[PDB]
């Protein structure tokens, strides 16, 4: 368990806000890209926002994505959307959290 990551995010996304999501990975030494995305929940079907971030020694494997859930993209109507998937994808890992 040498190769590890932290993606740190606001506890709650404000709709229409720009949420600065920062990723740090440890023990990598080759540069790699990751994408951080906000996807509709539970279907993961609609990508509300996505950010491509390069992790490398001059980054020091630290970067952030400015992600924004534009309000008219959420379906709205009778039910507000209470949840969304923050997802990260890279060569080395993928995780998504509600």
């Amino acid at each position: 368990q040498e190769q590890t990551y932290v993606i740190s995010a606001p506890k709650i996304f404000r709709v229409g806000a720009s949420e600065n999501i920062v990723i740090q990975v440890y023990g990598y030494t080759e540069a790699f890209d990751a994408t951080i995305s906000i996807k509709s929940y539970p279907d993961k079907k609609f990508s509300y926002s996505s950010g491509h971030v390069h992790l490398s020694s001059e980054n020091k494997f630290q970067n952030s994505a400015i992600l924004t859930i534009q309000p008219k993209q959420l379906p709205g109507g009778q039910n507000p959307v209470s949840y969304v998937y923050l997802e990260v994808v890279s060569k080395h890992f993928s995780k998504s959290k509600r």
């Binding site: 990551y5 932290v6 993606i7 740190s8 995010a9 606001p10 506890k11 990260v88 959290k97």
Partner: protein, 37 residues
């Protein structure tokens, strides 16, 4: 500031995190917080 635990430190900071480093804050649910500063 401070916190009971790494997940608690993040939660009380008003953050959450994804990690594979053997921590998650989904255990950290709590009543609305009324401390005064």
């Amino acid at each position: 500031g401070g916190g009971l635990n790494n997940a608690n430190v993040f939660h009380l900071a008003g953050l959450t995190f994804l990690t594979n480093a053997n921590a998650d804050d989904s255990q950290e649910n709590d009543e609305p917080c009324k401390e005064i500063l």
